[PDB]
Design a protein around this ligand. Structure first.
Ligand SMILES: [Mg+2]
Ligand SMILES: [Mg+2]
Ligand SMILES: [Mg+2]
Ligand SMILES: [Mg+2]
Ligand SMILES: [Mg+2]
Ligand SMILES: [Mg+2]
Ligand SMILES: [Mg+2]
Ligand SMILES: [Mg+2]
Ligand SMILES: [Mg+2]
Ligand SMILES: [Mg+2]
Ligand SMILES: [Mg+2]
Ligand SMILES: [Mg+2]
Ligand SMILES: [Mg+2]
Ligand SMILES: [Mg+2]
Ligand SMILES: [Mg+2]
Ligand SMILES: [Mg+2]
Ligand SMILES: [Mg+2]
Ligand SMILES: [Mg+2]
Ligand SMILES: [Mg+2]
Ligand SMILES: [Mg+2]
Ligand SMILES: [Mg+2]
Ligand SMILES: [Mg+2]
Ligand SMILES: [Mg+2]
Ligand SMILES: [Mg+2]
Ligand SMILES: [Mg+2]
Ligand SMILES: [Mg+2]
Ligand SMILES: [Mg+2]
Ligand SMILES: [Mg+2]
Ligand SMILES: [Mg+2]
Ligand SMILES: [Mg+2]
Ligand SMILES: [Mg+2]
Ligand SMILES: [Mg+2]
Ligand SMILES: [Mg+2]
Ligand SMILES: [Mg+2]
Ligand SMILES: [Mg+2]
Ligand SMILES: [Mg+2]
Ligand SMILES: [Mg+2]
Ligand SMILES: [Mg+2]
Ligand SMILES: [Mg+2]
Ligand SMILES: [Mg+2]
Ligand SMILES: [Mg+2]
Ligand SMILES: [Mg+2]
Ligand SMILES: [Mg+2]
Ligand SMILES: [Mg+2]
Ligand SMILES: [Mg+2]
Ligand SMILES: [Mg+2]
Ligand SMILES: [Mg+2]
Ligand SMILES: [Mg+2]
Ligand SMILES: [Mg+2]
Ligand SMILES: [Mg+2]
Ligand SMILES: [Mg+2]
Ligand SMILES: [Mg+2]
Ligand SMILES: [Mg+2]
Ligand SMILES: [Mg+2]
Ligand SMILES: [Mg+2]
Ligand SMILES: [Mg+2]
Ligand SMILES: [Mg+2]
Ligand SMILES: [Mg+2]
Ligand SMILES: [Mg+2]
Ligand SMILES: [Mg+2]
Ligand SMILES: [Mg+2]
Ligand SMILES: [Mg+2]
Ligand SMILES: [Mg+2]
Ligand SMILES: [Mg+2]
Ligand SMILES: [Mg+2]
Ligand SMILES: [Mg+2]
Ligand SMILES: [Mg+2]
Ligand SMILES: [Mg+2]
Ligand SMILES: [Mg+2]
Ligand SMILES: [Mg+2]
Ligand SMILES: [Mg+2]
Ligand SMILES: [Mg+2]
Ligand SMILES: [Mg+2]
Ligand SMILES: [Mg+2]
Ligand SMILES: [Mg+2]
Ligand SMILES: [Mg+2]
Ligand SMILES: [Mg+2]
Ligand SMILES: [Mg+2]
Ligand SMILES: [Mg+2]
Ligand SMILES: [Mg+2]
Ligand SMILES: [Mg+2]
Ligand SMILES: [Mg+2]
Ligand SMILES: [Mg+2]
Ligand SMILES: [Mg+2]
Ligand SMILES: [Mg+2]
Ligand SMILES: [Mg+2]
Ligand SMILES: [Mg+2]
Ligand SMILES: [Mg+2]
Ligand SMILES: [Mg+2]
Ligand SMILES: [Mg+2]
Ligand SMILES: [Mg+2]
Ligand SMILES: [Mg+2]
Ligand SMILES: [Mg+2]
Ligand SMILES: [Mg+2]
Ligand SMILES: [Mg+2]
Ligand SMILES: [Mg+2]
Ligand SMILES: [Mg+2]
Ligand SMILES: [Mg+2]
Ligand SMILES: [Mg+2]
Ligand SMILES: [Mg+2]
Ligand SMILES: [Mg+2]
Ligand SMILES: [Mg+2]
Ligand SMILES: [Mg+2]
Ligand SMILES: [Mg+2]
Ligand SMILES: [Mg+2]
Ligand SMILES: [Mg+2]
Ligand SMILES: [Mg+2]
Ligand SMILES: [Mg+2]
Ligand SMILES: [Mg+2]
Ligand SMILES: [Mg+2]
Ligand SMILES: [Mg+2]
Ligand SMILES: [Mg+2]
Ligand SMILES: [Zn+2]
Lengths: 97, 94, 66, 104
RNA sequence: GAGCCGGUAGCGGGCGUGGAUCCCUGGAUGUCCGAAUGGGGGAACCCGGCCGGCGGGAACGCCGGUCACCGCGCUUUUUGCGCGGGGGGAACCUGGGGAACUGAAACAUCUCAGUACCCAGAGGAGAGGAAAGAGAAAUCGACUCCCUGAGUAGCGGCGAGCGAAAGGGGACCAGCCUAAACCGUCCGGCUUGUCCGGGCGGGGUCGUGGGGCCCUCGGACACCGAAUCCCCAGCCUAGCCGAAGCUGUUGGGAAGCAGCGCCAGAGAGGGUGAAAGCCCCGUAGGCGAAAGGUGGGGGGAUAGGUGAGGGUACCCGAGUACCCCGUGGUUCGUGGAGCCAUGGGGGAAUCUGGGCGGACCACCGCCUAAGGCUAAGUACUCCGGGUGACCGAUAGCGCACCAGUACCGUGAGGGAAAGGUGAAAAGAACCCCGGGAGGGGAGUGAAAUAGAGCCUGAAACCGUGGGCUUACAAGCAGUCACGGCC
RNA sequence: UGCGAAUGCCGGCAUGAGUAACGAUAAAGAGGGUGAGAAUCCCUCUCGCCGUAAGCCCAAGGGUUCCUACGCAAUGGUCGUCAGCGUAGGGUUAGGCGGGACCUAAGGUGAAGCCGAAAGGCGUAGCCGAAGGGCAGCCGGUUAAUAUUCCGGCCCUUCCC
RNA sequence: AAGCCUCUAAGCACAACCUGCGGGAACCCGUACCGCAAACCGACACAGGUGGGCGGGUGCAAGAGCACUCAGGCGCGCGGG
């Protein structure tokens, strides 16, 4: 679970590719791969900790989608409950029907 | 069902078991799951007797072989019951 | 036959009596055990079809409540 | 196991040593597919001196015949195969011999 | 439709034409463990709460019922309730992850290979699917699968090797729901306002661009019609009918041989004492469901669908397209490297908008992304059936036999051997030797060196009897010659 | 589809060979018994060995081996009439002993919570977890075989009313 | 950590608790047998390994040592020469 609670973004596997030599297009004989190996790429994930109704709700999101946390706060109707709260404010409110 | 002729299986028949008729002590094969308490009531209502002490013990199957195939007879349980002073169980007096 | 009638008399006779009739046959069965156990005192098949007829009763007893 | 012939029946023994003889089926064994007619096949089985017939050495007994070995007698013939009719409600046997009882 | 109480005889008892046993459908009962779910726990054991019951029954015990967690939904949050989920499945399927040996005759890129495998999920299939496609023809029209294109185009330490698509021929055939504009309703927040927001209903769903809003046209029976529901046929889960031969003869046995017959929509095949169309069971041809399953076919219903011109420029899926960085997918290994995907940064517009035709620019075309669903043609084989120039007990599955067993391993796990008397038990009464075992008679049998350590019964091996031979010869043991004895 | 070889595979049967060995150098002898059969079984006598054990009691572990009747194919390193072996029958009795309807330890597990591609890791309380803590039975008789369990005497504990 | 005692809290104080006495109530599992070994771990009736307790007497300085012995148990499952 290092995954963005709004966007859905999660870590992907990627190769890290080590190259040598001069681009063919700089008049080099061309690039060469000295190694290829798997790494991954995490989302740039942050806390957004926000106050909604009585309570203080904390989203874990990709820094990318940080705005949508505030969009979800602009959606306010009638919740006096505990944390959860976002269980409501979430995909129920992100999409629904 | 509500038993109680389910709880009491059969009289156990041996020099040992017979030697208990002399005192108030009658001894039966009972169903393996039966608590001392319910064995009491099952005898109290089967033989119209008062039961003042129950003793139980489990009896393990004996492994037996018909040749090539070995297995074991069922595990049993037996209760030896103390009927109240002077009472007896005539059903067991043959 | 016997069974046909036994099954027929058992319906129309309903449940408290069915329970009592069971409790009876059960006790009649326990007696049967004892006699086979002490040996020579039983000619079997009565053990079998008493057991069985207790089933038949109990199966009707089940009909009646459902 | 369908057979053809039953207990009451009268059969002719169509093959073997007892070939040609007619007798009544004394018993039918569907599991071994055998009928034992009598006294249409007998044999001699030596027996021990234990109780009844203590002194007895031997016994004659009727050995089952393969159910194919025999054919139904057909009241008047010694054929048939067999056939089937219906009317109401159902059931039958008939001689395609033809045409006859069994029945008994 | 006459026998039955399994393999299994026997003792000792019972049942069946008043229709048993047995087969098929439904039901009932269904201890305890197990997702295991009251709570524990070393699975098959232990300990409880609540309501009810039993016993003399308060203590004790038994019985019935109820009580896990998670998600969704309404509900006054609450007392809660409803519905669902969970686990298993031979292979097949998708998705998340993902090797090495090996190949390169060394080895790094490359290969093996997105394989093995591990994980999640789905179902009887799964996936995919209704163009921001192809890609050179004013071309084609969803998706999947086969053939072909083609070992082509390409890719490539341009090595080893990797390896497309368009098109054509087939199989199958199907197309739909939405978001927004706009209208209506309910509720919530309020700095009551032609307000903002959420919920529901309507509306609308496309690329010869569509739709909303305004005007005009008539827009009337309409026609169309499900993938949803209902009925029905048919199919599956038991069964049933089903032609035509006798005699004689050898023989233990006829089905052989002989005589004279007969059936055939049936001369497939298996049995029966040996070799049988006509003895048995079948076969060709027919028939059959009260009940449960199915039902893609037939029928019917319902849901849904259905216009023209003008004018407005209101809407047409956002952290999205687009650009850049890092990568993956493709035949494409950085290459002129686009296209599809996306971890990071910046970050639009709504038809005069956007994406694409292999860097980029023009021109000319194609298509309308950022929501969703969609039979069939396809994969598989735990399961049932039918066939075999498939095996026939060292073979065929590991197992033809009470095998995933014995046994071996702490465990994961490994893992065997072992079929055949006879047509029929007629499975050898009785006597004899003997403690028994065994054998001799007797008897059974066509046969008993078919006698159960039983079909055939090879060879190595062991033995008894007989013939020739051998104790002054010595050698790969044989061979050629002569002679003796049988 | 033809086997003689692969330290081939599976099976069978040879050779070595009546050979080595028969598992502690604590040690045997005789009389009687039984039985088809006796060095080997039973009983007497004598002799030898253990005795901080080679005796007795408990916990693991084993799981009927227990007691008795009948029995000797095989198992027993010989023999077997015996047996820990075959067949059969019997045999284990608890309010107080052990454990559980008590506690907590390491550790485990885990409402909350935290983390992690999935699987899953972590974690407060709680819960589980004992050869620790807590808790009420002693002496004797009895069976072929059980006894702080049955019986006899003398004591005790907790729940309910 | 509980049992245990004390303290109070809501609560209840016609409850409750304490002490004494009396009547009743008291469930599940283990219990044979071997257990320094022929019954456990060692393919074996294997000279190996296996935790706790008791372990008598006489003598030798002491002792759980050594010798001999009690109770109890054994002469080791081939023998004869
Ligand atoms: Mg890099
Ligand atoms: Mg912040
Ligand atoms: Mg940004
Ligand atoms: Mg007990
Ligand atoms: Mg009847
Ligand atoms: Mg016929
Ligand atoms: Mg009928
Ligand atoms: Mg009988
Ligand atoms: Mg009928
Ligand atoms: Mg059924
Ligand atoms: Mg029941
Ligand atoms: Mg449970
Ligand atoms: Mg309960
Ligand atoms: Mg649990
Ligand atoms: Mg109650
Ligand atoms: Mg699953
Ligand atoms: Mg499932
Ligand atoms: Mg994958
Ligand atoms: Mg490599
Ligand atoms: Mg390598
Ligand atoms: Mg290489
Ligand atoms: Mg090489
Ligand atoms: Mg190398
Ligand atoms: Mg690859
Ligand atoms: Mg599923
Ligand atoms: Mg499908
Ligand atoms: Mg789909
Ligand atoms: Mg490849
Ligand atoms: Mg094509
Ligand atoms: Mg089409
Ligand atoms: Mg709508
Ligand atoms: Mg509004
Ligand atoms: Mg709407
Ligand atoms: Mg609509
Ligand atoms: Mg327009
Ligand atoms: Mg027929
Ligand atoms: Mg003759
Ligand atoms: Mg003839
Ligand atoms: Mg001829
Ligand atoms: Mg034939
Ligand atoms: Mg012929
Ligand atoms: Mg034939
Ligand atoms: Mg037919
Ligand atoms: Mg506009
Ligand atoms: Mg672009
Ligand atoms: Mg690539
Ligand atoms: Mg690339
Ligand atoms: Mg390169
Ligand atoms: Mg371009
Ligand atoms: Mg694009
Ligand atoms: Mg294009
Ligand atoms: Mg295009
Ligand atoms: Mg669009
Ligand atoms: Mg779309
Ligand atoms: Mg689909
Ligand atoms: Mg099959
Ligand atoms: Mg074989
Ligand atoms: Mg085999
Ligand atoms: Mg063979
Ligand atoms: Mg095999
Ligand atoms: Mg094992
Ligand atoms: Mg003769
Ligand atoms: Mg003979
Ligand atoms: Mg012969
Ligand atoms: Mg023979
Ligand atoms: Mg034969
Ligand atoms: Mg032979
Ligand atoms: Mg000779
Ligand atoms: Mg000389
Ligand atoms: Mg000479
Ligand atoms: Mg020499
Ligand atoms: Mg030899
Ligand atoms: Mg020698
Ligand atoms: Mg020597
Ligand atoms: Mg020697
Ligand atoms: Mg010895
Ligand atoms: Mg010795
Ligand atoms: Mg001493
Ligand atoms: Mg034990
Ligand atoms: Mg053992
Ligand atoms: Mg035994
Ligand atoms: Mg003994
Ligand atoms: Mg004896
Ligand atoms: Mg022996
Ligand atoms: Mg011996
Ligand atoms: Mg024994
Ligand atoms: Mg007591
Ligand atoms: Mg506990
Ligand atoms: Mg505890
Ligand atoms: Mg944990
Ligand atoms: Mg403890
Ligand atoms: Mg303790
Ligand atoms: Mg205690
Ligand atoms: Mg004592
Ligand atoms: Mg004892
Ligand atoms: Mg006492
Ligand atoms: Mg506590
Ligand atoms: Mg009291
Ligand atoms: Mg005991
Ligand atoms: Mg004992
Ligand atoms: Mg010790
Ligand atoms: Mg000892
Ligand atoms: Mg011993
Ligand atoms: Mg020994
Ligand atoms: Mg030892
Ligand atoms: Mg041992
Ligand atoms: Mg030690
Ligand atoms: Mg001392
Ligand atoms: Mg001393
Ligand atoms: Mg001293
Ligand atoms: Mg000294
Ligand atoms: Mg000493
Ligand atoms: Zn006739």
């Amino acid at each position: 679970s290092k995954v963005c609670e709004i966007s859905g973004k999660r870590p992907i596997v990627a190769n890290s590719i080590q190259r040598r030599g001069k681009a063919k297009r700089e008049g080099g004989v061309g690039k060469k791969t000295t190694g290829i190996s798997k790494r991954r790429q995490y989302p740039n994930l942050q806390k957004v900790r926000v106050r909604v109704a009585g309570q203080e709700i904390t989203f874990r999101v990709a820094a990318s989608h940080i705005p949508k946390v505030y969009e979800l706060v602009e959606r306010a109707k009638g919740l006096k409950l505990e944390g959860l709260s976002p269980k409501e404010i979430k995909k129920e409110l992100l999409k629904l029907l | 069902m509500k038993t109680a002729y389910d709880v009491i299986l059969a009289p156990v028949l041996s020099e040992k078991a017979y030697a208990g008729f002399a005192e108030g002590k009658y001894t039966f094969w009972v169903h393996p799951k039966a608590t001392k308490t319910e064995i009491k009531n099952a005898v109290e209502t089967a033989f119209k007797v008062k039961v003042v002490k129950v003793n139980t013990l489990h009896v393990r199957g004996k492994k037996k072989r018909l040749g090539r195939y070995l297995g074991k007879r069922p595990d049993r349980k037996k209760a030896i019951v103390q009927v109240a002073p002077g009472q007896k169980i005539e059903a067991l007096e043959g | 036959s016997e069974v046909r009638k036994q099954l027929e008399e058992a319906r129309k006779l309903s449940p408290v009596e069915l329970e009592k009739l069971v409790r009876e046959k059960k006790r009649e069965l326990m007696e049967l055990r004892f006699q086979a156990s002490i040996g020579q005192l039983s000619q079997n098949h009565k053990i079998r079809d008493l057991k069985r007829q207790i089933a038949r009763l109990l199966t009707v007893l089940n009909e009646k409540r459902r | 196991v369908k057979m053809h012939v039953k207990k009451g029946d009268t059969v002719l023994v169509a093959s073997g040593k007892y070939k040609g003889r007619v007798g009544k089926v004394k018993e039918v064994l569907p599991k071994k597919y055998a009928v034992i007619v009598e006294g249409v096949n007998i044999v001699k089985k030596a027996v021990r001196v234990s109780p009844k017939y203590p002194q007895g050495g031997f016994i004659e007994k009727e050995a089952p015949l393969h159910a194919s070995k025999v054919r139904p007698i057909c009241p008047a013939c010694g054929k048939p195969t067999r056939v089937r009719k219906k009317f109401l409600e159902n059931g039958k046997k008939i001689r395609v011999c033809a045409k006859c009882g069994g029945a008994l």
